[PDB]
Design a protein around this ligand. Structure first.
Ligand code: HEC
Ligand code: HEC
Lengths: 86, 86
């Protein structure tokens, strides 16, 4: 499981691209707010493991390689907890 | 330019996993409703090109390779138009 408060603190770096509310403001960055928690965890692990390529995947990989598995769990719990609409 | 209507019709083969409204029930299948359209197109092209690996990506890769680029544009348009909340 993840710590939502810890996830929210860690999300400060993520906000620049995915929005302060998990809703992106740029069309090429995905919304994360209210996404399935387990899927968020799987996606983060894939970026961290260099398993996602193409388009802007390298940009996101650069943002995931330095995350611990606990950071990943916290971040996913936090984003999943946000309302998908805001 | 994706046709929402054509996308909605093509979506019947997607609904079993991603939900009829773009919100899934299975916690490892991501929600698609209200996601950024350009991102939806990029993610689909990535699966179609074998660019996403790890976890359950092979499952989605199997569902994307039979999609034409027009199908991808229509599907992204459709899902992006759906309300993120339902
Ligand atoms: C902009 C410079 C980014 C920063 C800072 C972070 N992310 Fe990101 N992320 C960005 C892009 C370009 C993409 C799409 C890459 C692709 O595969 O085409 C992503 C993707 C994600 C995802 C996947 C979303 C999904 O599959 O629906 C996740 C879960 C994600 N990003 C999380 C995330 C976190 C928690 C970050 C801070 C620690 C973070 N991203 C920063 C761009 C950028
Ligand atoms: C279940 C058997 C699936 C069917 C039918 C379809 N999709 Fe799917 N999709 C599935 C999984 C397992 C996942 C996650 C893959 C991973 O990388 O872990 C996905 C993912 C997508 C995505 C990526 C969303 C994101 O947030 O990045 C998209 C855009 C997507 N799927 C679209 C989609 C469409 C349009 C389909 C029908 C033509 C389709 N999926 C069917 C599982 C399944």
């Amino acid at each position: 499981a993840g710590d939502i408060e810890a996830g929210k603190a860690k999300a400060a770096v993520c906000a620049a691209c995915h929005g302060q509310n998990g809703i992106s403001q740029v069309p090429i960055y995905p919304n994360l707010a209210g996404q399935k928690e387990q899927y968020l965890v799987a996606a983060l692990k894939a970026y961290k493991a260099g398993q996602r390529q193409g388009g802007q995947a390298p940009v996101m990989q650069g943002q995931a390689t330095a995350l611990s598995d606990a950071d990943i769990a916290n971040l996913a719990a936090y984003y999943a907890s946000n309302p998908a609409a805001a």
